[PDB]
Design a protein that fits this description.
part of a larger assembly, 6 chains, A mainly alpha (96), D mainly alpha (45), E alpha+beta (106), F mainly alpha (100), A: 96 residues, mainly alpha, 53% helix, 4% strand, elongated, E: 106 residues, alpha+beta, 3 helices, 26% strand, globular, RNA-binding, RNA-binding protein 42 (chain E), U4/U6 small nuclear ribonucleoprotein Prp3 (chain D), Pre-mRNA-processing-splicing factor 8 (chain A)
RNA sequence: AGCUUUGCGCAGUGGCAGUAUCGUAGCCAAUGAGGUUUAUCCGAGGCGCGAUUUGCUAAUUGAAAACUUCCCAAUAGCCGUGACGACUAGUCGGCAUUGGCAAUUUUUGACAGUCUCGAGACUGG
């Protein structure tokens, strides 16, 4: 592989390091906020940490934030349909 | 239909290569054995 | 790591799930044959 | 086990039969041997 | 059984081009393959209710001698804005996968 | 070694265990089961439960070929688990070492 | 006419395939490559550089692995009751749906095992 590809293959462990220490590096005490919310994701990124931006985008790729919220909403309404009458509920309504 | 889903190795130094060579079949279970079975007795019978 | 096949877990060998035993001990075997004057040979023989 | 290599037995019979077909044509049938033995023996006097 | 596959066939061979740019290529593909083998029919699969291109397209050639040179020359060739990828057409319809299922058990 | 004894159940339990086949609130226990199933009733793997969720999310399911592989995989499980030794015995009795 | 030798080509069985198989356009090479054995003898490629098509199928991740979907509404036995109707408060037929249908005469199981030469016997401790 090319010298640039060898460079990127050696920056891979910096990616897993940055993603590992993300909750204490990507806080607001560490980098004073120019809080940029990640796109289609509820993560704010204090400070331009582009390695962390790539890792957190690759985690939350393909609209995983909305899919997590949708799955939690639909599973909770599954719970509320399982327990409809014994809480005195007429119906549930998955809001638009 | 005739492939197993559980494979038991008598000698303990084979389940770790069996993990590698059977990643095309993740449906199968590769466990070791505490009971060893004398299949060298199969060698001792004249036919085999 | 799966529970190794003990003498209290071997009863699971005979349910509907098809199980194999792989005994690889006898794969590589030799015979060690002497003539007295000269030297000593070791013939690798076939295994199973 | 007899069924699958029975199929492949018919197919290797087809394969050996095709080898014998390619030897069956291009064979110097009965008299092409005769004309080639003649052009071997009859020189250009 | 879609009633549109019957506009190319005259026992002619179809090349399958995919990875095509969905913003264009409606007749660009015809324009590019037109020099080869005299007026022909080359479609692009643009799905309905959307007007969006699904990628792939089918160019039907008159000869399988013409086909080999066309395929070898225009493989990855810049067409509209994406390099086309070329394979042979499936057309796995009913009258051939019935034969395939009958060839399975034999 | 245990027979299912006629006039007896407990030997079948000793068989299957051997084979390993085993505000003023209301005031109550809400037994929440959170379960993912497909239309056939099968308990669904979380990877493919997320796959069903994401197919319904994106509105675009699988292609034809991956559905062929997936459906043929499910009836491979169905044909496997609904069950050549007798054929081996009949081939051996026709002549003992059927070498492949 | 038959047998047969050598070289080449085709196909087939089998075997081998990173101390294997090649390319070489760079150089050298029978006007001699390369030689510790036998050297007034042997005789073929050598050094470097550079490589290791095609079809089919499986499996994985991925939302999507490339050949022209989900959801809602409705339709697809008996005992009672309500009307309609028929026949003399009673009886009968069809229709309809607002409770029920595991406790001896039926539809929620006296069944299961054993033995003897289509027929019987034993047990359920």
């Amino acid at each position: 592989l090319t010298n640039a590809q060898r460079s990127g293959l050696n920056q891979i462990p910096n990616r897993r390091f940055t993603l590992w220490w993300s909750p204490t590096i990507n806080r607001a005490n560490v980098y004073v906020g120019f809080q940029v919310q990640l796109d289609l994701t509820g993560i704010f990124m204090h400070g331009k940490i582009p390695t962390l931006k790539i890792s957190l985008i690759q985690i939350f790729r393909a609209h995983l934030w909305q899919k997590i919220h949708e799955s939690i909403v639909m599973d909770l309404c599954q719970v509320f349909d399982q327990e409809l009458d014994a809480l005195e509920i007429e119906t549930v309504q998955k809001e638009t | 239909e005739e492939q197993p889903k559980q494979i038991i190795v008598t000698r303990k130094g084979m389940l770790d290569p069996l993990e590698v060579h059977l990643l095309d079949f993740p449906n199968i279970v590769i466990k070791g054995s505490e009971l060893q079975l004398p299949f060298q007795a199969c060698l001792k019978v004249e036919k085999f | 790591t799966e529970p190794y096949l003990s003498s209290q877990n071997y009863g699971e060998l005979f349910s509907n799930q098809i199980i194999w035993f792989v005994d690889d001990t006898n794969v590589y075997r030799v015979t060690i044959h002497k003539t007295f004057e000269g030297n000593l040979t070791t013939k690798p023989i076939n295994g199973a | 086990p007899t069924k699958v290599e029975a199929h492949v037995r018919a197919q290797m019979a087809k394969r050996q039969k095709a080898h014998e077909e390619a030897n069956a044509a291009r064979k110097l049938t009965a008299e092409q041997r005769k004309v080639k033995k003649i052009k071997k023996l009859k020189e250009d006097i | 059984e879609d009633p549109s596959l019957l506009e190319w066939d005259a026992d002619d061979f179809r090349i399958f081009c995919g990875d095509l740019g969905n913003e264009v290529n409606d007749d660009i593909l015809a324009r590019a393959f037109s020099r080869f083998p005299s007026f022909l029919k080359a479609k692009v699969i643009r799905d309905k209710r959307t007007g969006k291109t699904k990628g792939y397209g089918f160019v039907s050639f008159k000869d399988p001698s013409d086909y080999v040179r066309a395929m070898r020359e225009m493989n990855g060739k810049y067409v509209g804005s994406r390099p086309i990828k070329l394979r042979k057409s499936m057309w796995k319809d009913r009258n051939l996968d019935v034969v395939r299922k009958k060839q399975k058990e034999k | 070694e245990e027979p299912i004894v006629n006039r007896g159940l407990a030997a079948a339990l000793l068989l299957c265990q051997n084979k390993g086949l085993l505000k003023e609130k209301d005031g109550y226990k809400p037994d929440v089961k959170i379960e993912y199933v497909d239309e056939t009733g099968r308990k669904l793997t979380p990877k493919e439960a997320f796959r069903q969720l994401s197919h319904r999310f994106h509105g675009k399911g699988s292609g034809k070929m991956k559905t062929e592989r997936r459906m043929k995989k499910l009836d491979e499980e169905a044909l496997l688990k609904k069950m050549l030794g007798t054929v081996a015995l009949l081939q051996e009795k026709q002549k003992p070492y059927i070498v492949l």
